[PDB]
Amino acid sequence: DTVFIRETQTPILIERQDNVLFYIRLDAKDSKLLNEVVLDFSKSTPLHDIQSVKLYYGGTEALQHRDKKRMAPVEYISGFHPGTTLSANPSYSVKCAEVVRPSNKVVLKSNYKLFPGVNFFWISLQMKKGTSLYTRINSELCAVKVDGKVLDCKYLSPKNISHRMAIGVRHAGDDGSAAFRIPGLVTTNKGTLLGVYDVRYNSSVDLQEYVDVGLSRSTDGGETWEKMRLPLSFGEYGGLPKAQNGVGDPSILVDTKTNTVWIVAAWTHGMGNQRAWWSSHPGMDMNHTAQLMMVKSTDDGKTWSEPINITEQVKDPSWYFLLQGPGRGITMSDGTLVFPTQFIDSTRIPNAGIMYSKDRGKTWKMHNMARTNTTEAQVVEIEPGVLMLNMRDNRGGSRAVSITKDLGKSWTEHASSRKALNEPVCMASLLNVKAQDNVLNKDILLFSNPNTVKGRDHITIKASLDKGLTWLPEHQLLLDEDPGWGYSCLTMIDKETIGILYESSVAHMTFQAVKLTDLIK
Amino acid sequence: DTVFIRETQTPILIERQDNVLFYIRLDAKDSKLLNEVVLDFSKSTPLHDIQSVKLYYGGTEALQHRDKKRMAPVEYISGFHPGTTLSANPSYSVKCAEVVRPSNKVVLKSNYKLFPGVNFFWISLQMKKGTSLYTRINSELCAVKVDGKVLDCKYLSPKNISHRMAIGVRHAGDDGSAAFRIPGLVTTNKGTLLGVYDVRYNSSVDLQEYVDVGLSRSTDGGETWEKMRLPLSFGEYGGLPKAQNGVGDPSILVDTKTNTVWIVAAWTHGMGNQRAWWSSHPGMDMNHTAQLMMVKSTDDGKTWSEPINITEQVKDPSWYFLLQGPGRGITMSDGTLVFPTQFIDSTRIPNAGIMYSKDRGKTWKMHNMARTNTTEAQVVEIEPGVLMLNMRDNRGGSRAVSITKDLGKSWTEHASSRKALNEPVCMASLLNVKAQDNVLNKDILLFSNPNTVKGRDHITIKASLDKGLTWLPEHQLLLDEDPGWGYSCLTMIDKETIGILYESSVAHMTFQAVKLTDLIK
Amino acid sequence: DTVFIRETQTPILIERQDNVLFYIRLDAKDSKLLNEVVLDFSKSTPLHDIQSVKLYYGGTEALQHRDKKRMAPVEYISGFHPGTTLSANPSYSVKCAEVVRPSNKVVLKSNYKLFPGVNFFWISLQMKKGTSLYTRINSELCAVKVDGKVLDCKYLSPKNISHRMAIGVRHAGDDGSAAFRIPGLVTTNKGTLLGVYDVRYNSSVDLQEYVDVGLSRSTDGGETWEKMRLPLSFGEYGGLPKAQNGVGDPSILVDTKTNTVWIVAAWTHGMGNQRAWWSSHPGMDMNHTAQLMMVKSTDDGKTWSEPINITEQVKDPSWYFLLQGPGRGITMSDGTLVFPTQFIDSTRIPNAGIMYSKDRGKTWKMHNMARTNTTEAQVVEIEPGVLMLNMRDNRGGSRAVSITKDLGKSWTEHASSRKALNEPVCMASLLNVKAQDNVLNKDILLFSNPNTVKGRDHITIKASLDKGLTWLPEHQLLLDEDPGWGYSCLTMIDKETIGILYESSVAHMTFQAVKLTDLIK
């Protein structure tokens, strides 16, 4: 017979009880017993870090569904059902075998009775609790033995996959919140990691709703995270319900001249239970339009000021909706702080741009839009005094890229625009790492998004060595092949290590660490 | 100004901390203060049963959404979110006022500051723990005072609403199950109430999935219910996951000759995670087709036999799918036991019919379909030896009704067929009560169904006094105007009272008691 | 083996070279030859009217598609491809046999080699050129013989089907027009039939586009139709393209006092190539909003006046769009002429109503809407001075029905609103036939539409004998089971005969005559 094998390319959550490593499907109807499955973990693998390898049985397939060649009948582990994302759903899988503290060779003896039809199996990988974020797992499926015969394997995945670790900074249901979304991430001058996100208590739906801006803080490069803080929350302001007071879509930056940290977010007041994208209207006060609120921290992110309403400084009253671009912002070489922005103009078309402060965040200003019918953007200083804006474009298919040398007074279309970086119309993260700040001593531009033109899957980091003109395939790393909500934010953990917080297929707020030399060998 | 008022016509769950009694909408944009709201409970209302009356504020509405003239911005209390259906979502409502242990006149003093636009309020009713299923609440909204002025009330709901109690036998999330569906209900010869249903552990989706048949048993007329039992469950039969072993769509009956209780259900084995409606195929064994399984109890519902597979007795091998009609079956005067049935034939068309036993349930037989393109049905003995089958009809609009005098060898279209009983294509309950068995000393046919042609809402009981020829509007009672999953099943609690177990807007398995004299005055 | 049989319930176009009478599907994989098919035509059938009966082979089915149990692999005859709707597509069917001038017993000898799998056949009925609209064909499928053996027939269609003739007054492609839509039909005082419709030259899409109002006139009760006329056409008015000058959605009425015939239609000027539903705006002139235009004929419909612009007489300036309800209007008992209407108000919501004239059509007036969120409607005088408006309702599922005794100043909800009459949100025809004007000497209310809650198919005529309170199944007639565009319009051809012009599955403008006694026996 033939045995279809599909090895996964998904984050291994350290804290998870099960992680899908392999899917196995057997089509023979005359078979009776699965004797064993044999695996081998290479010596490059930190072998002492694997707690357990298990073999699960997933049953059979509906007869009219078998033509489609699905590798499982159902999702065995959920990354989205609140409170139960850390374990395999026991009603969907039957554990057939287990090797605890495996060596290089793993022999899962099951002698399990088979259905007269399709049979599904899968291999679960469970890491030890204190495992390092840099542990990489390589695994070879050596043999599938059915009815005494070792069968021929047909692989649907590439060879030499390296499985990477992740920590779920937030999971569905944590701290009473159904969902967490829209991540931002920075590293302070002291090396502290600060990740921000929407705390969406009632559901995953956008504003308007009961939404706070939360923050996780790590002092050890992301191995552990402190209890969630709430830098922005407005409760029952004005007497209205909490769900008519949400604040979200955070963007965070570190003022590198002083280590003051800033968070800007959009506060929606009223608007029933409708979406703010359609409910924010012209005007300037909270009863008409979303409010642009900013908080700061002068103690390395531990405590946060009371919100400051900066709406009047930057919003044209004719606009329907002004808000920041989610993710992060920057400090320019000359000390200017910059936040990406987006506004819906009087004709109900969104346009991306930037706001900037030359007085350490006390006053902010917006000059002109970068491009029509664009929304979420991130910005970088690609040369001293030259800003590059990388934009979600409603035309579809690819990121728009524009340049400004005058803080947004006039814009130029970049050569890479609407060609080089494909997207499914989604948030994308851009981060420039100057030669002086990384071990390769070369300017490296990093980009992260779902590497498709349709669908939020295959979350990928890409690197450019020519200031974003070309993105060579060999300088990219696939992080998550499965579907998720798609948003991500990059930061440098240290001079040689990238950190990423993103919405993944395994956890709402997923954190991973990647050696720069893994992207650029 | 004007103040829109809408009184609810929805079950008052005794165990709930909140129940929506009134919706209130104020349109004045220039107003400043809601001073008070005044309520009155008639002297007919047992006031000693009310724990508390509350005034809640629901905020305002999106400016572009005010066209649609709803009465609230969001659903304040959920009947479907697992684990949280018994209290109002505190993020959607702000409590303004509360009167504990009210008297006839209730003054809810709030002096609550209003939004410059639409303002939503609502009144919550909380009953005491020991409240009876027969308590009636009549409530009159006397005044809404804004800025010192009593405003003009415009009511969107009729006068003389009497609010009726209910008990949630099963609620979303109970005993670890996401949902409960498909109710059946009978009264044993000892007056014991037995209610059956799907226990749908993972979600509300139909077979195939992890589904058991559960049962709730009450010896006090439905005021209290014993711990859930599982008369049918197949676990990991054959080594397949539990989710590939569901059993559901139960039908229950009482052999009135002996008080033996019978439950029949459809067991689906394998089939992946697809719907049994498409995945059950021709054949006879479990690896091909759904199995028709039966359990019995001879101790008044307390314990249950192991399942009996009767598939081979009644199923034609060419049918794709044979199953019972959910709800209940009957004992005919001559002792014949009858269960409605439905099968998908080789043409992929479903057809309703009946199966019967002449030997107290030891063997069962099926003859011919009653009507093409029909599914779920319920049956009564409308005259001696004459069965009436009332059918969900895929043509749409109304119930089909057919008669058989030879246990399904030949069928006749009934005069009421496809004209009198409107439906949105959904399960409906039918129950016949002979003159000698009820306090009105009239033969009474009872029907329960969502009283619509589209949408599963306005669950209503209808009564016919001429053996189902006519359904006069004055002999109908609205129980639940809000949306739900729509199924229901009737029984006689006693000679004076109807019991109904149904899927409601407030609980997955909702029980209510209704005096025959409320229906027939 | 088994042979699945589906007899059709669709109009037989007299002018068609082929009409599908039976679908045949054989699932046997070991069979070799279809020897023959034997048909029987009753002696009620005027046999002299059948030109030919044919047996066609339609080939096989995709292997993954077979479980769906379709009765054909493809549509054998198109009602919609311009210029090719009158013959079977010969690339989809191979002719196996033919009986020209059949007698009562028809033997189609084929000895046709069968595919080793699913095999499709079908039987074609072709009528003689001069056949009458009243001819009825009753046909029995006597035997399907495969490999010498008469097979067991499994019917998907009811017994006692009577196949009815139809004439395609307009077919896709006729007179250079891609499409014809939106029928209206009346009978003048002289018995002349007048059918009006959109002539949609470029495609089937709604205004704006190159659209005229066309008219077919018959002096022999619909057996033959005069060359198409154009009562309304605007060409390059103002110098804009013909496609920025369309007029459509006609409504026609006979002033029975004088036999003057009126047609009202909506003329859209400019608006690029967008849909008038969104492009007509507030105002009154043609450069801003659709114009309500009227023409009259005083010579029994042979010639038509130049259009009169009556917009200023009844349009409120704040409305986005005012137009007639397509179909027909009435002449009330007191001489008032009445057209149903529909307007999109300043809040972008559509509402139905009526306009009327008390001076023989010289001046027109509108009072108040009947109901919110309603569009197309038809009106009758259900009793002297009492108008019944039957409305397409955007809430879905069923017609709204309202009553006015003061020509739209005030409205009352009819008992049947949103309960009695089913609907998929589509145009529907309503026509009242007074006792003295028909042969049953009873008031008869007639209704025609797609008899579904979803999908435009099963075009059906329904009759009510109690002024629209009840619509009994026995007084209904299915005309066309297959999908079409769904609009229809009724008239009385004479005191004994209904006429209907409608969009069918076989022709854009399909005309049929139906005896009143066939509806009400």
Ligand SMILES: CC(=O)N[C@H]1[C@H]([C@H](O)[C@H](O)CO)OC(C(=O)O)=C[C@@H]1O
């Ligand atoms: C105001 C608001 O909520 N915006 C939402 C954003 C935006 O709507 C898109 O960029 C425009 O198309 O999209 C998403 C998303 O689910 O991807 C989340 C944001 O919360």
Ligand SMILES: CC(=O)N[C@H]1[C@H]([C@H](O)[C@H](O)CO)OC(C(=O)O)=C[C@@H]1O
């Ligand atoms: C096997 C199965 O689950 N059937 C499902 C049933 C059926 O499909 C329909 O009656 C005909 O299509 O419908 C429903 C329903 O609430 O709508 C519930 C049943 O669980």
Ligand SMILES: CC(=O)N[C@H]1[C@H]([C@H](O)[C@H](O)CO)OC(C(=O)O)=C[C@@H]1O
């Ligand atoms: C102005 C216009 O085009 N009206 C169109 C109508 C209308 O859009 C709907 O009644 C309200 O939405 O719909 C259709 C249709 O076959 O669906 C045809 C009419 O031409």
